[PDB]
Amino acid sequence: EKLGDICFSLRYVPTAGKLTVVILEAKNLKKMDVGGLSDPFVKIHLMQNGKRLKKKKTTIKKNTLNPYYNESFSFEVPFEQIQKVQVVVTVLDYDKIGKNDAIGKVFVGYNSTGAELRHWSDMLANPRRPIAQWHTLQVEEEVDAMLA
Ligand SMILES: [Ca+2]
Ligand SMILES: [Ca+2]
Ligand SMILES: [Cl-]
Ligand SMILES: [Cl-]
Ligand SMILES: [Cl-]
Ligand SMILES: [Cl-]
Numbered sequence: 001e002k003l004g005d006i007c008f009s010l011r012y013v014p015t016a017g018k019l020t021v022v023i024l025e026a027k028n029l030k031k032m033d034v035g036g037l038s039d040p041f042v043k044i045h046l047m048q049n050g051k052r053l054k055k056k057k058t059t060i061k062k063n064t065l066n067p068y069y070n071e072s073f074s075f076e077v078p079f080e081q082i083q084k085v086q087v088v089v090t091v092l093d094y095d096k097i098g099k100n101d102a103i104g105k106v107f108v109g110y111n112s113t114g115a116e117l118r119h120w121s122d123m124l125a126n127p128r129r130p131i132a133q134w135h136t137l138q139v140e141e142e143v144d145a146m147l148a
Contacts, residue, residue: 003104003137004029004065006042006089010108010123011130017078019046021087022071023058024132029065030103032093039095040067040103045088046075047107050148053085060094082124085109086147091137104137107147 009022023042032038039062046054054075061067077085086109092100108120119133 001030002028003139004091005134005136006091006106007132007134008089009130009132010087010119012077012082012123012127014079014082014127017076017082019075019077019082019085019087020130021073021075021089022130022132023069023073023089025066025068025070026091026137027066029067029091029137031065032101032103033063037063037065038093038103039063040065040091041094041100042069042071043088043090043092044073045086045090046077047086047088047147048084048110083110086111088143088147089135090140102140105140105143106135106138107143111146 006026007024011020041060042058044056056073058069058071086107088107090105091103094100108116122131
């Protein structure tokens with residue numbers, strides 16, 4: 001059972017120092033509820049050098065492995081700093097009681113690789129243009145080890 005995939009857009013406006021992330025949809029999420037599906041929501045963190053700088057989150061979708069969000073988030077990152085940050089996208093299962101367990105996550109930006117680096121590079125190369133791309137979710141343990 002794969003963890004799932006997430007589709008989001010990135011847009012960077014260098015003059016304004018405006019970094020926009022639109023969480024579009026996730027698919028094929030791992031089932032997190034016993035005898036059910038999942039109740040997924042998404043967190044978006046701006047990081048640098050192992051520090052959480054800013055945190056944003058989507059609404060919760062109930063009883064789905066294939067949630068649509070279409071929710072936009074913006075961060076202030078000046079052009080002198082944009083190459084030095086990470087944007088971390090985490091899908092979690094909401095439970096009314098207990099910690100919300102991460103399904104999986106990915107990050108783009110400084111120290112990203114593969115399709116994550118490709119997405120970030122495309123954003124940087126195309127100022128003011130939103131670029132949507134799919135990403136495979138990865139186990140929290142591994143991504144956090146990269147980010148710490
Ligand atoms: Ca659960
Ligand atoms: Ca749940
Ligand atoms: Cl909600
Ligand atoms: Cl708990
Ligand atoms: Cl939480
Ligand atoms: Cl894609």
